[PDB]
Amino acid sequence: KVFGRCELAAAMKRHGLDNYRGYSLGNWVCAAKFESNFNTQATNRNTDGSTDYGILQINSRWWCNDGRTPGSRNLCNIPCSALLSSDITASVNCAKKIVSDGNGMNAWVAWRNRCKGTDVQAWIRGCRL
């Protein structure tokens, strides 16, 4: 599924991401835009044998099990395929753990390259939240 910008913002605010750990809703919507362009089925294989899954591109090396990532851990205790659902619940709950893993939102490279330090409030424009 491909979320409209405000549609995703609503879904995220609904799952408690607005201001979570000090990160405004805009930060999350912006991370989502550049990590997967709001596509829940988005996937990117990495050169280290891992794969990034879903709307927030969660990595299989440490966060979910896809059965084909060497020395992989499953800290979020879920199959990576669960991160490809139209329901973002799984991704959000896993994301909540990642953002508290000692690097803030820096865990998402796209957020770091395209959202950090910017006027992220613009990603929430036009949304009746």
- What is the number of other CB atoms lying within 10 angstroms of the CB of residue 115? 24
Query: What one-letter code names the amino acid at 61?
Result: R
Instruction: Give CA–CA dist 111/30, Å, rounded.
Output: 7
The number of distinct structural domains making up the chain is: 1
- Under 8 Å between Cβ of 90 and 82: yes
66 annotated as a binding-site residue: no
| Number of helical H runs and strand E runs in the chain | 4, 3
Helix (H, G, I), strand (E, B) or coil at 59: strand
Cβ-proximal residues to 54 (8 Å cutoff; 6+ apart), any chain? 36, 40, 41, 42, 43, 83, 84, 88, 91
Q: What is the DSSP letter of 106?
A: G
Query: What one-letter code names the amino acid at 99?
Result: V
Let me know if 52 is a catalytic residue: yes
Which one is catalytic: 18, 35, 66, 119? 35
Phi-psi region of 70 (alpha: psi -120 to 50; beta: other; left: phi over 0): beta
- At residue 123's C-alpha, the angle toward residues 34 and 127, to 5°, is 130
Domain residue limits at 103: 1-129
Which one is catalytic: 7, 18, 48, 52? 52
CATH number of the domain enclosing 82 = 1.10.530.10
- What is the number of other CB atoms lying within 10 angstroms of the CB of residue 117? 7
Q: To one decimal place, what's the resolution in Å?
A: 2.0
Please report which helix (H) or strand (E) contains residue 99, including its range. Answer: none
- What is the number of other CB atoms lying within 10 angstroms of the CB of residue 31? 30
Let me know if 66 is a catalytic residue: no
- At residue 49's C-alpha, the angle toward residues 27 and 81, to 5°, is 60
Instruction: Give CA–CA dist 1/117, Å, rounded.
Output: 29
